[PDB]
């Protein structure tokens with residue numbers, strides 16, 4: 005099973021630097037070129053650069069946009085890829101993905117990124133890291149709609165799950181909104197009235213940048 | 226090499242055919258391998274991109290018949306023979322003949338039959354009120370089309386300040402939208418009035434859907 009996992013994302017002050025890592029497994033690391041790609045919120049993917057495989061001498065190349073500001077390297081003993089980012093500005097705020105690139109020197113070779121990481125969000129801002137507050141949304145028929153209101157967090161993102169991921173049907177999560185320097189969103193779920201409150205409904209709100217998870221059990225008024 | 230895609234977005238009904246274009250400033254045909262180094266990726270909301278087509282026309286493992294890549298040199302196309310609900314996504318082309326470059330992407334949206342929203346109103350929780358805030362939420366669920374309007378009324382008078390509106394992405398299963406409208410007051414503001422009303426206006430009817438509650442209940 006091929007695995008790519010990015011880490012190091014979060015809030016960084018303007019002018020500062022940041023190193024991203026991309027842990028891999030499930031393939032011969034040294035056989036593959038490895039690429040970094042980023043994507044500003046709501047914008048297009050942008051290729052940043054790659055590092056070639058062992059057969060090619062692990063040489064690096066970069067896009068014009070980041071030449072002389074972003075640097076790539078790889079630990080071939082731990083199978084870890086890195087991205088060194090320098091002198092960051094707000095424009096660098098984006099989700100950063102690592103992707104397995106080509107292996108033209110051994111085995112199956114085709115031009116494409118067969119595997120991608122889940123991505124890690126970097127936001128460049130002079131502001132303050134603040135974990136969200138989570139509030140229940142409960143009514144004042146055969147179905148009932150509940151949810152959690154998530155406010156006052158920074159930076160993005162937060163993820164919301166229900167019953168620790170066991171409640172997945174009928175879930176609606178609206179896009180975040182920025183107001184007065186803080187983000188908020190709401191997540192709702194519709195279930196049969198025979199399931200609540202007779203049974204447990206809980207939302208799990210994760211905020212990676214602060215390493216925080218909040219649980220909110222949904223209770224009747 | 227500069228990559229350019231068209232259209233920026235489009236909407237079609239399920240079952241319909243769609244064509245997207247991708248152009249490069251230089252030929253992507255590698256004379257050594259005799260292949261066009263152009264790939265198509267699919268990226269669904271909140272997900273990482275997924276490879277659909279490589280070498281302009283070859284389909285990646287698992288990708289359905291319905292996706293066909295074509296073209297050569299500088300002009301390329303991605304055709305979806307019959308679009309379905311799962312196809313909601315942005316599609317990116319990517320050249321790899323000289324380093325790599327992504328196009329700007331094409332967002333594929335789905336047209337479907339008009340549907341009225343189901344409307345719910347939520348008074349503030351005690352844990353927020355305890356902290357001195359009062360958020361009132363109007364939730365409009367599973368409607369189409371996307372444009373929709375919510376009017377807030379306090380004690381019968383319209384309220385415009387303190388309101389924030391946000392939509393979901395188009396649903397991957399039924400192609401509908403949902404949206405929340407949140408009126409945020411201070412606890413004191415909240416306790417100065419009784420009746421809280423939100424009215425949802427949508428093309429599915431002349432008359433708004435009205436939901437209300439009274440603070441003293």
Ligand SMILES: C=CCO[C@@]1(C(=O)O)O[C@H]([C@H](O)CO)[C@H](O)[C@H](O)[C@@H]1O
Nearest residue numbers: 056106108109115255321322323324
């Ligand atoms: C074993 C050849 C590797 O060739 C590379 C390379 O490393 O530079 O170059 C290829 C070009 O087509 C050569 O003109 C491709 O861009 C390929 O993906 C890769 O970037």
Ligand SMILES: [Mg+2]
Nearest residue numbers: 063064065066
């Ligand atoms: Mg060079």
